[PDB]
């Protein structure tokens, strides 16, 4: 426990030092004068302030944090700014839900929650009251976010942080300029469109104010109206004189020429309600709610219910249906009717629907159902399926034939009916051919929309939009599809979409899966409602009654990063003075144009030219955004709008469009989903408290660098804490015994091996950092680096060479620094370095001798085999080393070499190999030993490349063993080791010993 506390002490000290030194505050005015090696602008999408940042946020931002930590060592000047997103309604929603209990009860509220979660967050009793207003949320959470992030140690120029609502005047002016420019270029449009809608919230329910189905949109349905004929059913007797329609949803209108009846569920609760023209529709309550928000009722959302009833009360009723050949069709019962899809009212097309003929034959079989539900023989018997569409592999009555084939006799055979439904599922969309007059011999795909229009024009059908999948909102309201008027961004325009597609071609997506996501969400995308009325944020500058949603004021704010340090300077709300002395409202549309558009004219403004020139310098220098890292959830919405709006704001400058986007997975904790409800949860401040800034950052580097779910494992973080502590102890020990280390020329075999391994580690780790495989960089640059140092220490019999030890410490500290900058800064100062490690440069790697490394691996294997053989049957040991392969081994290896040379390095099958080696008469006495030899060669070939096909080792085997005979004798606890050239060996050993695999007898 004391080790984590030691790490925390080091981190706090070093953080204060960094803060005072103002190391991570970059200014384009100064950095544009010294052309170093280019700028590096990274962004992490600013997180919502409806709470405290948790370990997933930290994992996602660690990507660009490690990126800048690496790129600064390579000479780039970096900009890693960090804003905070307060736009949206959850803050206001939970603040008003709080004021609800504050007013309707007391402090604390008497029950029979929002007050409960606030007290869970550990707040005092008399301080949750202040959270009734949203302004207090905005004053409370963003400071704690900044505090936690600084306590982590991010390389952020905090002078550029900001807030996103209209509480910030500067960011509000920025959003105003953006949306004025968008409306000036016909990007915003007012219109009445279909959209997923929250009745409780009274505004469209986009993706970030949702709770189920984060990408679901509306789905269209043809709503048939079947006129109820007199004599009306009993329960509708009070509705005589009015027109009553059973409304049924379908997706195949072209089939309505073959209606035999209408199915209702006898046990479902149906509602007959008055529509806008005074007619009466019989559907269900959810269907009627959707219709009420799609203009079907006189008032929006108001459903005037005039008759509740059950399906059994509707049974037997006579109907008039469109297109069908039967003048009167009846309402019949169907047991298997979902209450989630449509209106609860289905039509009977028994020729091309298996369920329909199933239920019809069930009613036709026995008297049981017809009597249990009151269906006389007039309502079932004279009704036969009508040939309407022919599928070539089935016939006119496709469903009839495939249900006679699958031998179905009940409407409850879920398995057989599902199979039959899938068997003709899409063979009717295309291969179906119409048969009715006016369409005889027409491709069904070429006529279905015309038939739907025919019914709509005749007033016999309407358009019913329904959520394709159930969508719950933050306010726990079930969403509908509303045809409502709003301001929308026209992401559907072909020119805009093609230009953003070209922008996606140039964009760097670190894998093809992310690009596929982008292309799919680019094709599918269309009109996007951006206007809200309830929530926080910035109002449309011309329609002050509409607020801009969170996913629409967040598309180009990266440009505001470049100027925020001079506009508002650190003050999150922008309420303090301006360092350049620019008034908040002094920023006009033309002023912003001049700041961000290169060929924009300097407009009439009381601002001096130097201030605007400095802002324009900052923007032109830092842009474009080199990298934006995010969880993959933001690809289908925020990042696509990001590309769109960048194309829209700078349509002439592709050099200002985003460069790279990197998506990662969502963070698991201990291999489980990170949810407070399961107790498997860690906030950033808690994670720091538990593992220090450096141990959690280490375990986060190891969490995952693919798009698959990342995994933060706490045990690995504890092990890394232990290893970091012992590493600091070892560096201290080495600095203490500076003079106890061997000096002079670094010449020994071990010195050379270790120097080569160190340079190889540098090269591997640099490559891993370029690829942003941070887990792989941690593997090669820490665990394997430490393995090389531990081996060098274990084998250095004459003590480790001082200069090599301190080169290793320096380089290891440089390689670990982007992951654990506090520990590495502490060790940097412990080495007596003048400057901070944040001024160091990437370590130069010397030469890498592959032969040295291969000989060290050979020595490892030899020692391992010696210790394994020591397990059984001393004091003296004799090792025999083969200079060449014995005759039979040499012959078989030559054959393998021939076959490898023959076909670009593919060894044939062991079948053919054993055939050829049996054809060679010299191998008679050895055919049993031959194929295990081939197997060993193939294994080590796949393991360590083709170098094992060499007829002689690249290094002196005996000399390698001799450079460490002393270590071998000391480790094996023996008194002497005799290394001999295997020609002195007896018959058995001389014949079996081959190079690289020395034999030995104790
Ligand atoms: C620009 C604007 C439209 C963005 C909007 N304000 C917003 O999304 N705010 S946020 O707090 O929900 O996320 C911000 C970043 O953090 C990632 N992330 C979030 N949770 C996890 C998790 N459990 N595991 C891994 N990564 C996560 C997430 O993808 C995103 O890149």
Task: Please list, residue by residue across 963-996, b when 16 or more beta carbons sit within 10 angstroms of its beta carbon and e when fewer do.
Answer: bbeebbbeebebeebebeebeebeeebbbbbbbb
Our answer on whether the CB atom of 45 is closer than 6 Å to any ligand 1 atom is: yes
Our answer on whether the CB atom of 633 is closer than 6 Å to any ligand 1 atom is: yes
The answer to the question of whether 48 is labelled as a binding residue is yes
Measure Cα distances from 994 to 468, 553, 705, 862, 982 in Å: 70, 72, 43, 13, 9
Our answer on whether the CB atom of 674 is closer than 6 Å to any ligand 1 atom is: yes
Which residue's alpha carbon is nearest to atom 21 within ligand 1?
A: 56
Is residue 51 within 8 Å of residue 91, measured between CB atoms?
no
Which experiment gave this structure? X-ray
Which residue's alpha carbon is nearest to atom 8 within ligand 1?
A: 47
Cα(419)–Cα(421) distance, integer angstroms: 5
Distance from the alpha carbon of residue 57 to the mean position of ligand 1, in angstroms: 6
CA contacts within 13 A on the Cβ side of 729: 8
Is residue 603 within 8 Å of residue 614, measured between CB atoms?
no
Which residue's alpha carbon is nearest to atom 23 within ligand 1?
A: 56
240: three-class secondary structure by DSSP: coil
Nearest one of 664, 610, 576, 542 to 175, comparing CA atoms: 542
Is residue 343 within 8 Å of residue 251, measured between CB atoms?
no
Cα(100)–Cα(102) distance, integer angstroms: 5
Distant-in-sequence, close-in-space partners of 352: CB < 8 Å, separation ≥ 6: 252, 255, 258, 388, 389, 397, 398, 399, 424, 428, 432
Distant-in-sequence, close-in-space partners of 565: CB < 8 Å, separation ≥ 6: 25, 27, 157, 159, 160, 579, 618
Cα(211)–Cα(525) distance, integer angstroms: 21
Pocket test for ligand 1, best of 42, 45, 49, 214 (most atoms within 8 A of CB): 45
Nearest one of 100, 295, 94 to 209, comparing CA atoms: 94
661: three-class secondary structure by DSSP: strand
Distance from the alpha carbon of residue 631 to the mean position of ligand 1, in angstroms: 6
Which residue's alpha carbon is nearest to atom 29 within ligand 1?
A: 631
φ, ψ of residue 475 in degrees (nearest 5): -75, 15
Pocket test for ligand 1, best of 44, 60, 707 (most atoms within 8 A of CB): 60
Burial category of 733 from C-beta neighbours within 10 Å (exposed 0-12, middle 13-18, buried 19 and up): exposed
Pocket test for ligand 1, best of 631, 645, 680 (most atoms within 8 A of CB): 631
314: three-class secondary structure by DSSP: helix
Q: Which atom of ligand 1 is nearest to the CA of 630?
A: 31
Our answer on whether the CB atom of 781 is closer than 6 Å to any ligand 1 atom is: no
Our answer on whether the CB atom of 210 is closer than 6 Å to any ligand 1 atom is: no
Distance from the alpha carbon of residue 82 to the mean position of ligand 1, in angstroms: 13
The answer to the question of whether 551 is labelled as a binding residue is yes
Cα(164)–Cα(86) distance, integer angstroms: 5
Our answer on whether the CB atom of 90 is closer than 6 Å to any ligand 1 atom is: no
The answer to the question of whether 105 is labelled as a binding residue is no
Nearest one of 65, 78, 81 to 37, comparing CA atoms: 78
Our answer on whether the CB atom of 432 is closer than 6 Å to any ligand 1 atom is: no
- Neighbouring CB atoms inside 10 A of 556's CB total 22
Distance from the alpha carbon of residue 475 to the mean position of ligand 1, in angstroms: 20
Q: Which atom of ligand 1 is nearest to the CA of 642?
A: 1
Our answer on whether the CB atom of 558 is closer than 6 Å to any ligand 1 atom is: no
Our answer on whether the CB atom of 634 is closer than 6 Å to any ligand 1 atom is: yes
- C-alpha 51: how far from chain center: 21
* Residue 680 β-bridge partners: 675
């Amino acid at each position: 426990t004391a080790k984590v506390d030691f790490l925390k002490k080091i981190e706090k000290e070093i953080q204060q030092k960094w803060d005072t030194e103002r190391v991570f505050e970059v200014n384009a005015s100064n950095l544009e004068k010294q052309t170093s090696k280019g700028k590096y602008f990274v962004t992490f999408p600013y997180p919502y302030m409806n709470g405290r940042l948790h370990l997933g946020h930290t994992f996602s931002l660690s990507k660009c944090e490690f990126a800048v930590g690496y790129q600064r060592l390579k000479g780039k000047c970096c900009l890693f700014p960090f804003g905070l997103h307060c736009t949206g309604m959850p803050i206001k929603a939970c603040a008003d839900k709080l004021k609800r209990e504050i007013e309707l009860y007391g402090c604390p509220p008497d029950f029979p929650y929002q007050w409960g979660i606030m007290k869970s967050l550990g707040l005092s009793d008399e301080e949750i009251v202040k959270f009734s207003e949203a302004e207090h949320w905005l004053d409370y959470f963003p400071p704690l976010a900044i505090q936690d992030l600084k306590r982590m140690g991010l390389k952020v120029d905090w002078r550029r942080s900001f807030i996103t609502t209209d509480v910030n005047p500067y960011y509000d002016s920025f959003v105003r300029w953006q949306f004025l420019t968008l409306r000036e270029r016909n990007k915003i449009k007012f219109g009445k469109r279909y959209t997923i809608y929250s009745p409780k919230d009274g505004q469209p329910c986009m993706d970030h104010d949702r709770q189920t189905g984060e990408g679901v949109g509306p789905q269209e349905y043809t709503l048939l109206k079947l006129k109820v004929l007199e004599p009306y059913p009993s329960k509708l007797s009070g509705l005589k004189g009015k027109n009553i329609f059973l409304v049924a949803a379908t997706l195949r209108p072209e089939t309505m020429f073959g209606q035999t009846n209408c199915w209702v569920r006898p046990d479902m609760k149906y509602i007959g309600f008055e529509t806008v023209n005074g007619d009466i529709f019989i559907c269900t309550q959810k269907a009627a709610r959707n219709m009420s928000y799609q203009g079907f009722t006189k008032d929006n959302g108001v459903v005037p219910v005039v008759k509740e009833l059950m399906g059994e009360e509707i049974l037997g009723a006579s109907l008039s249906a469109p297109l069908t050949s039967y003048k009167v069709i009846y309402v019949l019962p169907m047991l298997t009717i979902k209450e989630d899809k449509g209106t609860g009212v289905v039509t009977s097309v028994p020729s091309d629907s298996p369920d329909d003929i199933a239920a019809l034959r069930d009613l036709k079989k026995k008297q049981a159902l017809r009597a249990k539900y009151g269906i006389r023989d007039d309502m079932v018997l004279p009704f036969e399926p009508v040939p309407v569409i022919e599928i070539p592999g089935f016939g006119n009555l496709s469903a009839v034939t495939i249900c006679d084939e699958l031998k179905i006799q009940s409407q409850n055979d879920r398995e057989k009916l599902a199979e039959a439904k899938e068997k003709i599922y899409l063979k009717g969309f295309y291969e179906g051919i119409m048969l009715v007059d006016g369409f005889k011999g027409q491709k069904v795909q070429d006529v279905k929309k015309t038939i739907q229009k025919k019914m709509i024009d005749a007033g016999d059908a309407l358009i019913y939009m329904e959520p394709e999948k159930q969508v719950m909102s933050r306010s726990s309201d079930e969403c509908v599809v509303a045809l409502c008027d709003q301001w929308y961004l026209d992401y559907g325009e072909e020119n805009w979409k093609k230009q953003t597609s070209q922008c996606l071609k140039n964009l760097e997506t670190f894998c093809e899966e992310t690009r596929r996501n982008f292309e799919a969400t680019l094709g599918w995308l269309q009109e996007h409602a951006c206007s809200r009325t309830y929530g926080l944020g910035t109002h449309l500058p011309w329609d002050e009654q509409w607020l801009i949603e969170s996913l629409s004021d967040s598309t180009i704010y990266m440009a505001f990063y470049t100027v925020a340090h001079l506009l508002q300077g650190g003050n999150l709300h922008g309420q303090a003075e301006s360092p350049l002395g620019i008034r908040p409202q002094q920023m006009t549309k033309e002023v912003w144009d001049y700041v961000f558009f290169k060929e924009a004219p300097f407009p009439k403004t009381q601002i001096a030219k130097e201030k605007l020139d400095q802002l324009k310098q900052e923007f032109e220098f830092w842009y474009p955004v080199d990298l934006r890292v995010s969880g993959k959830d933001l690809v289908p919405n925020h990042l696509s709008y990001y590309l769109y709006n960048h194309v829209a704001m700078w349509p002439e400058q592709s050099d200002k469009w985003p460069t790279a986007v990197r998506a990662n997975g969502h963070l698991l904790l201990n291999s489980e989903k990170m949810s407070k409800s399961t107790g498997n949860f860690l906030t950033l401040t808690q994670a720091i408290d538990k593992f220090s800034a450096d141990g959690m950052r280490l375990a986060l580097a190891d969490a995952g660098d693919t798009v698959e779910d990342a995994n933060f494992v706490e045990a690995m973080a504890d092990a890394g804490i232990l290893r970091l502590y012992t590493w600091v102890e070892w560096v201290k020990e080495m600095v203490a015994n500076w003079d106890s280390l061997r000096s002079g020329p670094a010449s020994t075999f071990n010195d050379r091996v270790f120097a080569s391994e160190l340079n190889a580690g540098i090269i591997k780790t640099d490559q891993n950092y370029e690829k942003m495989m941070f887990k792989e960089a941690l593997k090669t640059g820490f665990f394997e680096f430490q393995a090389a140092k531990d081996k060098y220490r274990e084998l250095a019999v004459e003590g480790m060479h001082r200069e090599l030890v301190f080169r290793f410490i320096e380089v290891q500290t440089l390689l670990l620094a982007p992951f654990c900058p506090h520990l590495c800064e502490h060790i940097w100062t412990l080495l007596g370095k003048p400057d901070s490690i944040m001024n160091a440069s990437w370590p130069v790697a010397g030469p890498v001798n592959e032969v040295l490394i291969h000989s060290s691996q050979y020595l490892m294997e030899v020692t391992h085999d010696l210790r394994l053989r020591l397990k059984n049957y001393p004091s003296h040991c004799t090792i025999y080393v083969a200079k060449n392969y014995p005759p039979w081994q040499h012959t078989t290896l030559s054959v393998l070499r021939k076959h490898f040379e023959a076909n670009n390095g593919k060894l044939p099958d062991n079948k053919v190999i054993a055939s050829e080696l049996g054809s060679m008469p010299e191998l008679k006495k050895y055919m049993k030993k031959v194929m295990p030899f081939v197997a060993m060669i193939k294994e080590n070939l796949e393991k360590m490349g083709p170098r094992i096909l060499d007829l002689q080792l690249e290094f002196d085997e005996k000399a390698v063993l001799m450079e460490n005979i002393v270590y071998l004798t000391n480790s094996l606890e023996l008194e002497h080791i005799e290394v001999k050239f295997a020609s002195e060996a007896e018959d058995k050993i001389r014949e079996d010993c081959c190079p690289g695999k020395p034999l030995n007898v104790f």
